[PDB]
Amino acid sequence: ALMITDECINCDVCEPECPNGAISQGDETYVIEPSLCTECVGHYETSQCVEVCPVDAIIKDPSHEETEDELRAKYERITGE
Ligand code: SF4
């Protein structure tokens, strides 16, 4: 999973880009819900929030380090099939 750091400028642009609805506005920055963040695996070749963030505030979350198989498994859980 990714996470949004303290560099977030609360610009809103990443929220509509997430295929899983993992991003929402928090207290002081936007926040990724890790159980919904597949790092876009299953939907896109790369993370869509990272592509749009203007200040590079979105990084790997080391407390939710996931393999590709885990991220694809999470995509399958979220979307069914
Ligand atoms: S990496 Fe993909 S799944 Fe994770 S929060 Fe960003 S847009 Fe959503």
Ligand code: SF4
């Ligand atoms: S795109 Fe980047 S700066 Fe804008 S709300 Fe999302 S994480 Fe924060």
